[PDB]
């Protein structure tokens, strides 16, 4: 009857990650709703990777609740460049996703640089 499942054609915006003061290799990655979200989000697909060569498929997806507009990652590597890359999905389907976010991760085990 209903198949009129379309879903999202924008990304998220406010895309920030940074370092939990709990933990290092912890990040709060907040975001926002998109304009073109052609409907409430039901839920929100965030993605993250070191590497770029690799499909956004072979990322490493997180569901999160729509309700929600932040996600925490934990195991984390220490001083790795970390993409980030997320987007919108309602009880249609989802779009596309945010520009890959260049965020460093804390560094537990310096050399004493400073």
């Given at each position: ?11 998220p915006?406010d895309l920030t990650v940074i370092?939990r ?5 912890a990040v709060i990655v907040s975001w926002q709703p ?10 929100y697909?965030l ?15 997180e569901?999160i609740s729509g309700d929600r507009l932040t996600h925490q990652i ?10 980030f890359?997320i ?28």
């Open positions: 009857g209903s198949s009129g499942s379309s879903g999202p054609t924008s990304a915006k370092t003061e709990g933990k290092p290799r998109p304009l073109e979200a052609n409907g409430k989000i039901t839920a697909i993605f993250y990777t070191l590497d770029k060569n690799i499909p956004i498929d072979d990322w490493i997806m569901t934990m195991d984390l590597n220490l001083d790795t460049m970390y993409y890359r987007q919108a999905r309602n009880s249609k389907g989802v779009g596309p996703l945010s520009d890959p976010i260049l965020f460093r991760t804390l560094k537990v085990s310096g050399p004493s640089s400073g």
